[PDB]
Each structure stands twice: as C-alpha cells, then as structure tokens.
Amino acid sequence: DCCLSVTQKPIPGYIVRNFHYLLIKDGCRVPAVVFTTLRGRQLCAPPDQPWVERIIQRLQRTSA
Numbered sequence: 001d002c003c004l005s006v007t008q009k010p011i012p013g014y015i016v017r018n019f020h021y022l023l024i025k026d027g028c029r030v031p032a033v034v035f036t037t038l039r040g041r042q043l044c045a046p047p048d049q050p051w052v053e054r055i056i057q058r059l060q061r062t063s064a
Contacts, residue, residue: 002028003044010051011035011043013058 002022015037022032032054035043045052 002026002034004042005036006032006044006046008046010049011037011045011055013055016055016059019056019059 016037017038017040018035020034022028022034022051029049032044033047033056035045035055037043045055062064
C-alpha cells in the first residue's frame with residue numbers, strides 16, 4: 001500500500017510542487033498519481049479525474 005490516502009476532491013494547482021506516477025511494482029495495489037505539496041505532503045489522486053490531468057498539464061507548461 002503506497003498511498004496513505006487518495007483524495008476524492010480537487011487540490012488547488014498553486015499547492016502542487018510536482019507529481020510522480022507510482023505502479024503496482026512501486027509497492028501500490030493500483031497505479032497512483034502522487035502530488036507533492038509545497039510543504040512536501042504526498043497526496044495520491046485518482047488517475048481518471050479530469051482535475052488531476054488538469055494540474056499535470058500546468059506542471060507541464062510551467063515545467064523545466
């Protein structure tokens with residue numbers, strides 16, 4: 001179990017430092033998108049929610 005708790009509800013973009021994708025083999029039951037907050041809190045998010053794609057598309061434009 002790699003996710004203490006998936007969030008149902010949208011996280012504000014401005015809170016998110018970055019994302020990483022974790023697989024079964026990473027020690028997860030199901031694959032998970034992990035958002036790391038500015039404070040360093042891991043928030044697992046549902047890969048199928050448009051609000052998750054939506055944050056990742058900003059981390060992509062503002063990226064590096």
